[PDB]
User: Fold this.
Amino acid sequence: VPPLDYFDEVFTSENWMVRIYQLKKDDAQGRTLRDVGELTRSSTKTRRSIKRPELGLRV
Amino acid sequence: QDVHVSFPSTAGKSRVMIGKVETVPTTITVEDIQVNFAIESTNKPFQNTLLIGLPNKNLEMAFEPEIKSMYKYRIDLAKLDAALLQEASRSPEPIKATLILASSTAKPKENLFREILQLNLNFDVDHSDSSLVD
Amino acid sequence: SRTLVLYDQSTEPLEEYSVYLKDLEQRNYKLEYLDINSTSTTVDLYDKEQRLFDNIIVFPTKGGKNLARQIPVKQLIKFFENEGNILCMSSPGAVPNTIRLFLNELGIYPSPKGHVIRDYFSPSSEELVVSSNHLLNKYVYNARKSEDFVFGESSAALLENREQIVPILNAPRTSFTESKGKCNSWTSGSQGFLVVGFQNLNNARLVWIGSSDFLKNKNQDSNQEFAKELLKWTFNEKSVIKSVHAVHSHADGTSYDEEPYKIKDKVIYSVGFSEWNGEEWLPHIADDIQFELRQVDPYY
Ligand SMILES: *[C@@H]1O[C@H](CO)[C@@H](O[C@@H]2O[C@H](CO)[C@@H](O[C@@H]3O[C@H](CO[C@@H]4O[C@H](CO)[C@@H](O)[C@H](O)[C@@H]4O)[C@@H](O)[C@H](O)[C@@H]3O[C@@H]3O[C@H](CO)[C@@H](O)[C@H](O)[C@@H]3O[C@@H]3O[C@H](CO)[C@@H](O)[C@H](O)[C@@H]3O[C@@H]3O[C@H](CO)[C@@H](O)[C@H](O)[C@@H]3O)[C@H](O)[C@H]2NC(C)=O)[C@H](O)[C@H]1NC(C)=O
Ligand SMILES: *[C@@H]1O[C@H](CO)[C@@H](O)[C@H](O)[C@H]1NC(C)=O
Assistant:
């Protein structure tokens, strides 16, 4: 079972019969909510990686 | 000195030609793949850039090849255009191509910055709900 | 309105940025000087989930373990989600590491060290001078007449296409960027930017300047006006907008509660605005604003 990023658990009953999840409010800086969870969850993969990215034109 | 050629090698029915309409280039000719080869004109090496786009909307992109002699500046109108055409097709304005050739030696006269096409294309407007325009 | 500066002794003196600082003190701010070449932490931005300083301005350092000891990335994020304001700059001779990863995490990409821009059509061949007909945005600084801003050796940035980017100044149309090699590696043309800004939700602003010698005492004659104006925009002192209460009712006096709406009839809608120039709230006049009556799909 992989982890979810866009939701979070709020209440879960006694014998695990009803589970209630809540939509997580949107990111205050434009970042996709998968990328911030991957940044927090995995503090490995450190590197220098000086290379220019492949972007489109700012219109 | 050197000579430089140019050709789109497009994937559509577009780009009718107009032409050009201090250290000037002489002329441009069409051999009608679909080469638009000019004649020799030079000032200095070490800087060479072809600019396609329009500066009224501050939107352009740069192509920098060399095969050196002679140069090749092929401009694919199928893959190497992203959102310039979708601005170009709403309000009909001719997109331009401009040649930059310069270097550091103090020869102000020997510098080259002048557009040498005024082309006009009609492939398709074709909004695919591509939001990243305005 | 407690600020907090970060200066490096080894690269520049601190008295070289003098005339912009204490005029900054004149409208009742309070500074806080803080070294990076003296080994004692003493900087807790957040204490027991309470943020202390309102503002941060930094100065260009040569990387180092000291800046990573003072503030790493996660305190900049958690500081910046709680309405703190940042003025930060870099240099071609020295780009720090955590600042570069913080800004790449925001959405603007500055060029690393060794890459420097240059122009072969400029009227002076030593420094790099940009004319005042490149200014994109208008609500931050509006150029009254023609001016010529002076930079030194400087870096350029290239950015993404988000809603929140506010670019201020641009590169000349005949520029490029070189490393030790021979090309236009990082950016080329007028797609490099030299002063950019960033607003966000829960409104809080930061600015990036791509040049070291833009706030020097020796260069104060040329660009004194522009620098003061950025220093007002960044600290939430100009161009803020407040919204007056919005009501809606029947065409007549009766409110919605007393007669709830039928399938069709006549209503109206009104709203009001206000703008703060530093001292008073004044009325804000704008030609276009719009109303939308949507269910899942706009109707009106
Ligand atoms: C049970 O549940 C269902 C799901 O919840 C309900 O279904 C929904 O119903 C609504 C309306 O009943 C649907 O809205 C439609 O969408 C169609 C489809 O267009 C296409 O939509 C797809 C996405 O699905 C999109 O990718 C395509 O590009 C394409 O647009 C659309 O043609 C309809 O017109 C309407 O779409 C809009 O309607 C709203 C207002 O209703 C406007 O904001 C918008 O501009 C647009 O067109 C309008 O058309 C009106 C009359 O048709 C007219 O009054 C407006 O002025 C406006 O524009 C006009 O356009 C025409 C021609 O272009 C001109 O002649 C004219 O001058 C003017 O310019 C919705 O899609 C649908 N949802 C799903 C999932 O199917 C269902 O109702 C419910 N049953 C019930 C309640 O009984
Ligand atoms: C700055 O750091 C260097 C490196 O350790 C040190 O030698 C020097 O004394 C420090 N202070 C100044 C004023 O240069």
The two ends of chain A are 41 Å apart (CA to CA). Chain A touches chain C through 13 residues (CB under 8 Å). Residues 5 and 34 of chain A are 6 Å apart (CA to CA). The longest strand of chain A covers residues 7-12.
